[model samples]
Target: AQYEDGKQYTTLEKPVAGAPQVLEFFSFFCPHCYQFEEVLHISDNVKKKLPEGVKMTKYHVNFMGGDLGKDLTQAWAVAMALGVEDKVTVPLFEGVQKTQTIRSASDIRDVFINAGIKGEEYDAAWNSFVVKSLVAQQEKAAADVQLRGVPAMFVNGKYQLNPQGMDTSNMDVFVQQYADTVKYLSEK
Candidate 1:
């Protein structure tokens, strides 16, 4: 096997469920995650390869971007609620990591607005109780994982991606290997 526990990925200390549930931990403050979003496009690629019934979610890790961290995470959920992740993620990442334009949750809305999402939608979703609770759930999920960095994958809440285990030298190869790993773990 190319992957082994503690090598390719370490099993969680407190594993959640097994298979069909994937969480991708990332931060807008981190350039690497931004690159993963902009360059690798790993999340979408993996999603393409996933079998039906698998749930893959992009989680905003809390330990980055200071107080704005949680706020940004909420914006992520807001974007999700609006079904505009493809429209907003890059803009938000550019605002936070590249241009330094997004300084607060309020500023995050600016990006969303520029992305053609209605201001009312952002406001409604920002103030949504459901979105707040979703953020809370991810907050606890972040607390559960011994996450060492951003753009990390947690498969079935059991297997954590080992960057070293996958061949990073080639983009397509890496994606296939990563997808393979996720598919492998999904059944375990």
Candidate 2:
């Protein structure tokens, strides 16, 4: 696989330099993102394929769904703070994007509540200073990236797969290339 910048990847103006990682910018309300998370399971799949020490981070963008979209961000922050993202992200996606039942932040609490996390516990973490800071960073990064769409996965917060960069003939090829690109940039 021969991937080049401006084609296979694009360098960011404001790089989030840190550990080797794939930072995915997505919105729960986005259909394709939901598909990757739930159907194709890209988040989990890619992580497994990545070399050890290379991690994946998901950032929910607030470019869509209006005010409710901002509310959704809160839920992600809460899940992230409690280290229950694996438990809540998919449910929240289904609740907000698919079922269309989760509306307010209270509704969001309900999803976590059923996840075996008590309402008060969820409330405490949701209102914590750490989560608040995370929410701020999440919003800031979304704006900082100047992204035009959802499901944008960046390597080491610098490189993103080109719009038509990889073979999309099937999941296996895409996953391998995606993981390979991540592995390449992770050490670069």
Candidate 3:
């Protein structure tokens, strides 16, 4: 196996239940996170290859202090709540780094509006209590993981995978190692 416990990643004191989780913690403002555009897209492949007992999710990192960070985090929460997260994710990242400017809540909404989200619908999801609570939950869980960086991966809430630590000499090798690691842990 390309991955091993205590090396590529570490096991948590307690395991997450219900299903094995592969959570990617990222921030829209992080240049490195944006740079992982290819690997991020391969996450869909990770989902398909995952066994029935395994799952994948994206967690927006909110520890980045500043109004832009907060706005982007909230925007992610809203997109997740409205079930448009997948649709907005790529563009959201690209927009913030490339073409579109995202500095406020309204600018965030505009990203969705451009994606065909109705004005009223965007408003509802943006301020929805569910979105707020979920964001808070992620923020709280982040402390447990000591999530101090973007593009970090956590498997079953135990093993943490930092892209910076991965062997990126071959992108294919990196993705394979990641998927293999998730499979290795999920079987545990």
Candidate 4:
């Protein structure tokens, strides 16, 4: 099903500039988010199919306002800063969703280590001031959008491409609908 402009998606307060950006708000500790991983996996197929001027970014949400959320979000921020998200992303998800091993920053650090990130490098990034600043910025962005849940998708920094009114049982249709909405709004 195609997205309804006003219902399925809404305009962003401030539109992103340059190439269109598709942002996915997610959390490693959320089971629903873990379930959505198949579609949000940043697969090669998805990249090839994206509109030429479109790109995607993932943000780890800190909605719970707790230590766990802070830790996981910071870990992801560090991974992104260190350019190891592609390597640590799936393992971090699986570590929490499948193996149930992720409990804190220490556990996440171990996942990075197992993913071949040197302990020293991971430690440096994890404790870096830059990571902390980025985490604060990400939290602010999510709050700015009034994000209330995980697995939320935004296009061009302004539109919240919500799946509430769409049929989410079919992954392909769900993803396609979002892509179509992004392409449509991006061309406007």
Candidate 5:
């Protein structure tokens, strides 16, 4: 995934500063984003399938936290505060998907504990500056681009495919298309 200048598609600074980065704007509550996760995994499986010098990074978009999507961002913040991103990020998606309820923090915690993170750490992390920065960063992304939806894929700083706007029937193809587009752009 290669970022353009300092930004991904809509968000910014997902990968290392100098490396080309691929950042996907996604949400835990969005089923489409979750589905897109599979495609991302597939893409990872065949790293050679992507263009050289491109690296993929993920930014879980903040939506459904409130009118401006604050609640979800707070959860992300909690993950960062804990320094247990893997403990919370993926499970947050799974938890919401399982409950089909975006407001279930308890469910989020259940997934966290199941994932091997101590429940106690979540408490402290939830209130820390890390989570605060995570939340604020998401707000910046949303404010910067007037983002409205989830699962937006930016290849080399341009919008390629968004899960919210794309046809589910063609998602796999879209992923491939996005990768090809990035490969093409990186050649420039």
Candidate 6:
């Protein structure tokens, strides 16, 4: 339930779907992450084609605006509370990007309610343990990583782009490729 120590962690928390501890560090407000959603979806589909035990965890990062980023963090919390995180994550990202009025937590809550998660459910979820953990974890991730920007993804205990100069456009591919890489690493 906690991340490793002495590590610069990102929030794309996709736990090793077939492996043991694969993590995905990502944010909901980044344009690159917006593009990465499609790629993540593709990777999810492909991951399904693999065997069982491949679980994924998504951590929402708050690196964009201070209060505004807090809204994104809480949104993830709400989804996690609903137990519909896998269903709502990409859609929530798209809602924020596509909708004309996702400026506050209340506004974002409206979107979730419209997405079949009624306001009360979202309300409870927003205040539930899932959201609480996500919010606290995000705060921990921020302090732990000293994160300065948005859209960071980490797999296992390593930053996805270790060399720091890799092509970011391939990040979606990198996510999938990283899962396979983790599988290989776990085998070793």
Q: What's the lDDT for all of these models?
A: 0.81, 0.78, 0.73, 0.74, 0.57, 0.58
Best by the TM-score measure: 1
Residue 160 local lDDT, model 6: 39
Question: Model 2, 43-156: lDDT tens per residue?
Answer: 776777677776678877787788878877877888888889888887889998888888887888888998989888898988899988989878877666678798888886
Q: How many clashes (backbone atoms < 3 Å, residues ≥3 apart in a chain or on different chains) does model 5 have?
A: 10
**Global fold similarity of model 5 (TM-score):** 0.66
Q: What's the CA error at residue 25 for candidate 3, in Å?
A: 0.7
Colliding residue pairs in candidate 2:
none
lDDT score, residue 85, model 6? 70
lDDT of 6 at 137: 70
lDDT score for candidate 1 against the true structure = 0.81
Please list all clashing residue pairs in model 4, or write none if there are none: 12-158
Question: Model 5: per-residue lDDT, tens digit, 1-188?
Answer: 44343232233344223322455567776776666564455334324456656676555565555432445566666665666665566666665676554455666666667777777887677677777777776566555545677756555553444223323466566566555555554554
lDDT of 2: 0.78
| Order of quality (lDDT) | 1, 2, 4, 3, 6, 5
- The count of backbone overlaps in candidate 3 is 0
Candidate 2 is scored at a TM of 0.88
The numbered model that scores best in lDDT is 1
Query: How do these models rank on TM-score, best leading?
Result: 1, 2, 3, 4, 6, 5
Winner on lDDT between 1 and 4 is 1
